[PDB]
Each structure stands twice: as structure tokens, then as C-alpha cells.
Amino acid sequence: SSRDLLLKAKENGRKSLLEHEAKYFISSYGIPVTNIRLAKSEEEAVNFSREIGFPVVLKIVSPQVVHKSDVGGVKVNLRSEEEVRKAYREIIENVKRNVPNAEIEGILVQEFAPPGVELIIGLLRDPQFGPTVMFGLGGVFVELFRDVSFRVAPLSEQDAESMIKEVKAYKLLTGFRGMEPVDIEAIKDALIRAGRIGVENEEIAEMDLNPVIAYPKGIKVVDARIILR
Amino acid sequence: SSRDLLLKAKENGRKSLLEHEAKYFISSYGIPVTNIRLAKSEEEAVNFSREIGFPVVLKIVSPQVVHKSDVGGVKVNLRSEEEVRKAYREIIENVKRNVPNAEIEGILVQEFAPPGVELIIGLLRDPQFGPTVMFGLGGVFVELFRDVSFRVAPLSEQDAESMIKEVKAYKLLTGFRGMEPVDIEAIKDALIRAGRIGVENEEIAEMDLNPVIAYPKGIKVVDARIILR
Amino acid sequence: MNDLERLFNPSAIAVVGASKDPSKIGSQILRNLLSYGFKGKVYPINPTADELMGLKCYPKVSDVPDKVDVAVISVPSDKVLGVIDDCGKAGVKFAVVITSGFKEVGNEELEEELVRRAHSYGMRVLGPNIFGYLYAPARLNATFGPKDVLSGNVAFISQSGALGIALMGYTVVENIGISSIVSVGNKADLDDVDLLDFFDKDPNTGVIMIYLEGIAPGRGRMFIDVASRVSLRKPIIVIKAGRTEVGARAAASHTGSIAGSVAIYESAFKQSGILMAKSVEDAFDWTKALSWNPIPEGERLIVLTNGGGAGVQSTDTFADNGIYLSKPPESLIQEIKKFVPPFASFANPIDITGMAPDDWYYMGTLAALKNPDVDALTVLYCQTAVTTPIGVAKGIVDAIKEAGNSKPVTVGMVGGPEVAEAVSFLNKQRIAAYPTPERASSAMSALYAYARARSYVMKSLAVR
Amino acid sequence: MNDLERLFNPSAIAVVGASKDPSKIGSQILRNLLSYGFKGKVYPINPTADELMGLKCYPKVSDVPDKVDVAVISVPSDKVLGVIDDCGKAGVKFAVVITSGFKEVGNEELEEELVRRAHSYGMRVLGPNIFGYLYAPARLNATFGPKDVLSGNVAFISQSGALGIALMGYTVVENIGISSIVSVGNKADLDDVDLLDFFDKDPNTGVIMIYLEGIAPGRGRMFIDVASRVSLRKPIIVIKAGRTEVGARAAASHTGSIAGSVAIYESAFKQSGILMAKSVEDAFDWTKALSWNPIPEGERLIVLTNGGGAGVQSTDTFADNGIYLSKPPESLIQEIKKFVPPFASFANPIDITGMAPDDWYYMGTLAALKNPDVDALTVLYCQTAVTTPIGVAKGIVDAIKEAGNSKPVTVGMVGGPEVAEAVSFLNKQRIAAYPTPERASSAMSALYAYARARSYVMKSLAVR
């Protein structure tokens, strides 16, 4: 069961899932994720990156590092094994130098994400209403303008559709200069499933699918955070 | 007098200014523009390119080009005296070729515009209120969401400041992820001058400063269109 | 128990804390119970009195030779637990605790113990810190508020004390017919969900208005589930206290509670089919229209006006509420062209011009209501020299009757004292009438907002 | 030709089209003129009558042995140009043209000829297609509207006929004191700009309320210039007809014109320091408060309430208008702690508890108003049995008198018929009182909105 990931994390006194575990968990619910492998060796990364196909992105899986980029734990666009290979040591040094307290679960090999329209799907627990799903467009629209919608879970198809249409940046989903309309149905599906994750798993205090890329066909979660309690 | 640009156009039955002329006219009112020169000869284009500084954009100047991109009338990122001479002849050879019946005013040497926060400053004539200034954030914020503010000219400092703070995308001017706060005093200053242009020049029917780029210090109008009546 | 049938329709009610002194709260409640005409047994309870207001008085509820359903408790907080014990022994099912001095003044322990003790005897608690409750079908006024209300189908639940008891009086002024008034105060036990469940099943109640400051932790899901199903058949209007951040803090300290999230309450209200009113006046205007009208079957809303300016005010008000007018059906335009001049407008609003006499309101209103392709009607009147306000009003009444059907109608009338009387005349006949075109248009907008809210709920409950 | 002194203050006025038939419009105007008490000379003009209403009648204005300032013309449009010529011959300065059938029915040609010809005689035109005008300081009622209005300092200009004449009656019901009513109708010549200029210099007028459908092409700049300068001393409230896109088209069709830009009108009003009302109710509520109060000198607004609920409604409403309360001066809290219980809240609103008797409203209002760190007061009252509405009102009256200053005050009172009477009582004293806490708060917010509007204009006029 995918619940084993939650149990393992609890047993190890951890209060969030590691990035790859979060995506496995999410994926088990039918929410599409960018493909990933956890590299336990310079050799395995380079293979996993050979396997997943190219380019790849590399970053550090550690229970101890949270904002990765400013610690130098994120390397990118690595088409050849050799292109990657320097990155494996490159990040290792950078985290060793700046987080020697940190535990190194391994290095993460991340499949590439063609650009698209970015989205946020969140799950929180409101004291009154319990598991609540939130939606908004990525970048400055959630982060700066706070343009988000909420629905108390479980979500009906009506809930999902209307909360998408509700945000001010909604027209970013229906075609604009240099961007086709994206798969609204696929967004709705993910919103509903996010709500289901909250209703069913009491051990999850919070979830953040950010960023999520919307395409004309399908969506893909690029990064996922799952907080435990 | 910069009014000679308007009179010249009127006499030739043109209903708008050429893009270099609109910039000169705007400049004469103290609105900053990206630096440009009109090259008469190849030797001047080269000398101007050194004056303006690389990289420069080269584009044909003629009243006949509906679309400058597709007559081979625009070469980009020219970084040397060599490349300037090269493009200076490809354009003319290609534009003489594909639109021979077209008076070549010259070739425009244009300064590179560093990236920043894009704005729109506009001027229109309302039947009730006459010359009115329009302000908005660039890209999707005006074009898709139509997030704009208006003030009837002439503008006071109070009018300019409040109309900036009034648009929903205002926070893009006060610092966000990956971008410093920009020069609001410069923006106010350009808005007031845009109003002055409209009040004073009855032959100008409308004006669009778009894109305008705002930096931590100052702003620069990249493109300007002026319609006559 | 979860069933409140015998809270609202008790056979016997005790008033604990009534006094020889008629100024005390218990005595005021007892006085209201008798004057409003309760037909069950009333048992005043007082340590020494032999009788109060012509009724045998007992020192304890447990000494009453009868099954007491409801004990209305009006003794100081330090005596309440004692009275609960006695009520518990006597087998009382509902304790209506008037008394203040509990969670709202920081004494949490006392409130939790009040509830704990009540429940150990299977007794439910309304309150504490409330002004009581009224239920018109049982001729039961167990409040110390006004002695009377207009009878009707609106249930009003109030978490606020002072505003609650004052709005109880305001219903009379606004001609709103009441089925029930319930003060819920501190909501230590019985709360909105419990009451909504009762009013759902209550055939005397057609509309539910709630002044709501907050919902208890962990109670919100159940609230949505219950309100949702109620909204399928009965409109719920909520006046939300603290719907701005600063106001959320303002209600957080008046009540003994932390402020919940504004945005999430608003989504919950949307998922529940609930209409959120930002003001008392909006809530009462809407309650009135929802109480006296069926929901519109469709979107063919017609506005009838003798003034262009009033008609444009209405148009703007409808637009702000997402309601857009469409050209009227050709058959209606033809019906009306039979008596209006050529310089009349038919864009919708239908402008019968400023020289319209009284009877054109009768003929116009009738034609619109009788027409198969008209779903709803807003009639606007500006007082001119050529009309009488009361004549226009009687024409609207006669046209509603002669049409036979029930389509929603609202009326907006502008003018001097004669209009104020005509408006009052219409409201006393349960025709939703208002002194401005914007209020008449806002009231009709609520009828449509409710149709749309019901639809939101129906679609959300769709079977997969 | 641009001074309107003799329009509002004529020595002599002719009514052309009055008749022995008392039902005709001309006759109705003449009756209003005499019964409202005009003290100058009135000249009925009729082809055959020797006298009308005991006044000597002439067949032509030019036959009158006197200088006629104003001619009120109530003859069919096919007769108007002839009367204009005779007025012109007689040296009439103002033609007030009641008559309909000009630009609003598609006959722009006739309208422009009317104006052209009037101007050739140095005569201004008001209208055409209007119900007339009223100027209280001259005891001049030249309308066929209500025969009377409450006297005061509000000038009301209306582009709408039916809504204008109805609102004229509504001012009485809403206790609004009037200095002038002006129907401008088609605005073929004299318009809002011309009128603002007069009311700017009129010491009888302190507030200007306009019902505005549109401004003429080329006229907007002059409108901002004049209105902004008026706004420095006198508030202007505009009810804008067609403030939504949908409504702008509807107004664009009602008048015969292209649809002005919604956004640019909004900006023009802001640049004018004008308060835009979205409704009749808001416009009248604000007018009352602005007519009867000075603007606050600072932002230390106090809300005084005998119940949390009303206080939170108030707080939310103030917050929706960009008004945020701050802690009361410690001197004030100390003053009020002399009589209120310790579980009273002093966060602002100052909650003196539901147990507050009538006297605490007097003491509370007096303490707040006399305090030098308090700039304005909203008093909120929820009717309970421990008080009387009229006692609370009289307390407020006495406190305002005792304090011997003018700080803005609004009052919100919630309850039954006794509250309606108390509110009516306060408004008859020119204390702005309302039957809900949101309306009292909205009205106080209008005073702040105006102070901020005036400041906007002052800042825009600052010398470089």
C-alpha cells in the first residue's frame, strides 16, 4: 500500500515525505507526475538519467534541506551521462560545504518538463471545515496577488469546475498570446483527487502541488510537498 | 520644432508617424526612449552602432512595410562592425528585392533594451473628456485582463501617482520574486508628459507607448506609435 | 436526543428564576409566555413564591407533578449547575440557559461542565447566554424580547444577543412573518446544524435567516451537508459577522472564539447553496422576497417602468448581480402596444412612459404575468401627477390575482408619503415592495441567486 | 448671459400655457407658484383669459407692462418657437421649457432651432422636456411636482423627469432639507456645469446631488474644472445612470447618444472630488449626513454600541469603505469606565453592553464628543427592554447640545415601531439617524469619503 510511505515516514520521526516519496504517493492516486528516480550512486544517477531519457535535472534528497536552489542542490539540462556526472559531485560538494548536518538520502533524477501554464493545487486543514482544496495559477498570481479559490472536500465535479472558473487569472487557461487552451478536465480531475487524499489520509496535515504544468492534453505535477502530523 | 514631424506627415497624407519619428517626437517632450539612429550610409550605420553600443537591432525604415519582419527588413543581435555591414546589405538587398516599389527612408540602428517590468502608457481622446491618459502593466495584464487606469489630462502629480497605485497589477512595481522595485517617480513623470502631449497636440488622435520598460532607476520607451487626425 | 420536536412544541415548560419582582428577566420571560398564549402548562420555579402570575409556583423542577420538557433557566451563573442537576433528576430534555457568564467572559470550564452535566442526564442545552426562543405555531414566546411578532414562515437564528433581540422587533416594522426566533448565543451544545435539521422538517418554515459569527471547530463539514440538503427546498440567508479581516477579529473577541478564514466560509456557503448578505437591510429585503414568492422557472425576467431613469437604475442593479435582461416576447410587446403610445420603449425595461395612468399598471402587469414566456416581473413606479400611488398598487394586486399564477414579483415605488403608504399596503398583502428601484431589483436578484444556488447544489450532488 | 441669479431669484415670472382648465400642466405650475408663496410678480399668459387664479392674465409675454425675467413655457412644441420669439421681443432672460417632443423623440432639428433662436435674443434655455424648477430661498416652486419640500441646504439636479419629480417627493419622507430642485431634461442649453457655477456661489446651498445620465461631447473638461472647485467647499454626490457597461448602453439608448466610457466617467468623478452613489438610498443617506455635519478633522472615529453584533456589522461596513478604527484615547476609556461594567469592551467599537440604560447613551455620547482626541462618532443602538428608544435619542440630542461643538455624528438604531419613531425624531432634529448599523456606518463613511475627495482635489491643484 502507498500508505506504507506515510507509515515509514512517521516511524522515522519525519514530519514530511521526501520529494520522491511524495510524488509516488500522489501518483498512486492517479495524479500525473514528472518521472523520477532516486540516485544512490553517481553511477545509478547516470544510468537512471540514461534510462529516463534526456535532458534530466538533478537535486538533493535530504531530510534536512528545504529551499534547495540557494544551497546549490539543483542542477539542470544534462543530456549526456558526462554532462550529468559533474553535476553529481558538483551538488554533493555544495551541500557538503553548506549542510554537513544534513542527511543524504540520495540525489534525485528528474525527467524534463516542457513549458506550459503553471498551476498550484493545495490541500489544507481548516479548523471548521476540515480538508480544503485550493487552486490558483502559478508564479506571481498566487504568490504575490493571492488569487486563489477554495472548496471544502470531498469535491464534486461542480466544485472543481466552478473553483477553476472563479479565480481572476482564469483566462490564462483558455488561450492567450502564444499559448493554447489547456486541459481543464485534467485539472478538475486532479483537484478532486487532491481532495480525496485529504479526506482519506488523516496523517497528512498539508499538501502542495507546486508547480503543476497544464498542457493542451493532461497535466503534470513537477514538485510536491506533503506535510505530516 | 518637433511639430515639423507632424506637419511633414500631414502634408504627405500619412495618418501616422514612422516609428523613429514617433520616438523623436516623444523624446522632445522628455520621455526617455531606447537610443536610436537613422543610418544614411553603411559607414554611418557602423559608426552609429559603435555610438549606440552593441548589440544593436537593424531594421528597414519605410512607409510601405505593413510587416517589417517578413520583407527581410529586420536583423537582430548584431554585435560587430562586421555583422552590421553584413545585415545592412542583406536588408536592403532583400527589401529592394521583395518590395522594390517602396521608398527606403533608411535603416534604423536601435539600442538593446535590457529586460525589466513592462508597462503600457497610452493616450486617447474621449468624446466627453478629450485627451485621456491610460496606464497599465504590460503583457497579459492589459492585453488579456484589461487591467488599466485612466486620468483625464492634464495630469497632476496626484493623478499620476494614484492611477499607478489603482491598477490591480500594481505590486509588480514594488518588488517581487526575481525583480527589484522599479522607479515610480519616472513612471509618474512619463504619464504627466503623455498627458501634456495630448493636451497640446490636437492633431494627435491617439498614442501608444508599448512596450515601456521600467527599471530600478528610470524607464525607457521601446516602441511608440502616434496616430494623426 | 437529536430531535427538537419537544423543544419547539413542549407540553410543559418551567421558568426557573421568575420572581415576585416583575423587572427581573425570569419574570419578563414568564410574562411573554402567558401573553403570547402558550397552551401547554407553565411552571414558574422560585425558592419561596407560592404563585406567580396566577400560576402555582414550585421551589424545584423536580417537585413539579408533571413531565417538564423544557426548563428556561434565568438564575445567576453560580446557581446554574445546581438547577441543571435538579432538571436532570426531573427528566427534563431541554435546558434553555438564559444566564450569561460562561465562555464569553473566559469561564470555559464552567460552560463545558454545564454541558457535561446536562448530557449525563440526556439533557440538551440551548445557549448559555441567550435571550431565549419563540415558536409561533406553538404560540410559544420564551424570550424577554418583544411580546409579539407577525406570524409567517421565516425562521431566524441569531448568535448575537443584543442585535438578535432588536431584529426580532425589526421584523414587525419590515412586515416579515416569523415562524421562529432562536437565540443560540454561546452555542455550547445545540447549534445551527441541529436547528437547520429541525427547520428542514418543519412545514411551518419556508425560509431560514441566520446571523452567524462562527461555527465550532470540526462542525463545518456537517454544516455543509445539512444546509446543502435544506437549500434544495428552503432558502437559507446568512448574515455573516466578521466577513472582513478586521471584523473577523472584532467578532473573535465579542464571542469567546478565534476568527475563522473568511475565504473558506464563503466557499462553504457557496457549496451549501446559502445566500450571504452583507447587511441587515439586504438580508431582510431578500428574506421578504424569498418568503412570499416561488423561485423563477427561467430567465425571462421582465421589468415594467413608467420612468426611464428608474429603469436604468434597475438595469445597473441587476447587472451588478449578474442578471441581464433580454428583449421581451413579441406577444407581450403586442399586448402592451394596444394602449401605450409609439414613443414607449420595449428593450426591457418596458417603459410605458411618465404619462402612464394607474390602469396601465394593471393592464401591463396582467399582460406580463399571463404571458407564457415571462418567468418573473419587477414593476417600477415613479410618482407623477397623473397617477395615485395607492391606485397603482391596487392595480398590481388585482393583476396578480387575475393572472392566477404564481410568478415572482417585486415592486419598487418612488415618491412622497403617499408612496410610503402604498408600499406598506403592498407589503401587508405579502407582495414584496420597496421604496427604491434598486432595492426592488436587488430583492428580485435574490430570488434568482437562490435558484442558481439550488442548481449549484443539485449539480454537486449528482450521482456518478 | 452666464449668470443665473435672475433664474433662481426673479422679480417677475410668466407662466405661458396656464389655463382655466385646472388639470393642464401650465395651470398646475401656476398653482404651485402661488401656494409655495412666490413674492415677486406672476404673469399668467393665455390667449383668452382675463385672469387666472386671481391674477391679471395677458395673451403675450410682450404685452406684460414689466420686465419678465423667466418664462415658464407649457405649450405644445408646435407653438414653442412662437412663444420664444415673443419672449425674445420682451427681453426675457430665461426660457424654462416644460414642453416635450424635441430631441428625445428624434426631433433634434427643432431643439437646435429652439436654442439658436433663444440665443439670438440673449436668452438661455432650461430643458426642454423638464418638470420645471424650485428655489426655496426665493419661495419659488415652478414645477408641477409636489407643492412643498422641506427647506434646507441640498440642491438636487436631475436629468431624469419621472425619477426626478418622484425623488422630489421622496426628500420629504427622508427628511432631506432642500434649497433647490432643478429639472434639466434634454440639457439643450443650460446644463450641470452652468448650474454648479451658480450653486458654488449660493450661500443657501451646502450640498449638491445630481442624477446624471450623461455629459455632452466636448463638455467633460469644463465639468471637472468646475466640479473640482466646487468640491473644495461643497460635496457633490452623483447618481450615475449607466454605471455598468450594460447600463451605459441602456442609458445610451434612453437618451439619443453614443455610450460614454464607464471607466473614464469614474475617473472624471474622482478628479472632480465627486462621490458616486450606486443607488438612490445611498445617495440620500449620504446627502443627509453631509448636509447636517461638518467633515471630520481627523481619522479618530469612535463607534459606541450596546451590542457586539451591531458593532461588528459597523466594523465590516467601515472596512469595506477603507475606514479602519483604532484604539480610543485613554482619557475616553477612563471616562466611560466610571459607569460601564468591567466586562465592557473598549477596542473600538466601545461596547457598553446590552445591559446599558438610556443614561449611558447620554454619558457615553457626551464623553466621546467632548474628548479633544475624538473626531467623529457613530452611535449604535439595539432595542432592549432595559431602554426606551426615545430616551436614547433624547440622550443623544442632549449630549450633542452639551458638548457644544460640531463633530460629525451618525446614529444607527435597530428595533420595532418605537425605534422607527425615535429615528424619525432624530432626523427631524437634523441628526442623521438610520434603522440599521450598516446604513449609519455607510453615512459616516460618506463624510470620510468626502474629506478624502476634497484632499485629492487639493493635492491635484498643488502649485509646483
Ligand SMILES: CC(C)(COP(=O)(O)OP(=O)(O)OC[C@H]1O[C@@H](n2cnc3c(N)ncnc32)[C@H](O)[C@@H]1OP(=O)(O)O)[C@@H](O)C(=O)NCCC(=O)NCCS
Ligand atoms: C440570569 C440573570 C438575569 C439572573 O440575574 P437576576 O435575576 O438579577 O438574579 P437573581 O438571583 O435575583 O434572580 C434569580 C431569581 O431566582 C431565584 N433563584 C436562585 N437560585 C434558584 C434556584 N436554584 N432555583 C430556583 N430559583 C432560584 C432567586 O431567588 C431570584 O428570585 P427572587 O427575586 O425571589 O429572590 C443574570 O445572572 C444574567 O445572566 N444576566 C444577563 C442575561 C442576558 O442578558 N442573557 C442574554 C444576553 S442576550
Ligand SMILES: CC(C)(COP(=O)(O)OP(=O)(O)OC[C@H]1O[C@@H](n2cnc3c(N)ncnc32)[C@H](O)[C@@H]1OP(=O)(O)O)[C@@H](O)C(=O)NCCC(=O)NCCS
Ligand atoms: C406642454 C404640454 C403639457 C401642453 O399640452 P396641453 O396643455 O394639453 O396643450 P394646449 O394646446 O392645451 O395648450 C395649453 C394652453 O396654452 C394655450 N396656448 C397655446 N398657444 C399659446 C401661446 N402661443 N401663448 C399662450 N398661450 C398659448 C392654449 O390655448 C391652452 O390654453 P386653453 O386651455 O385656455 O386653450 C404638452 O405639449 C407636453 O409637452 N406634455 C408633456 C410635458 C412633460 O411631461 N414634460 C415633463 C417631462 S418630466
Ligand SMILES: [Mg+2]
Ligand atoms: Mg420616460
Ligand SMILES: [Mg+2]
Ligand atoms: Mg431620461
Ligand code: NA
Ligand atoms: Na456585548
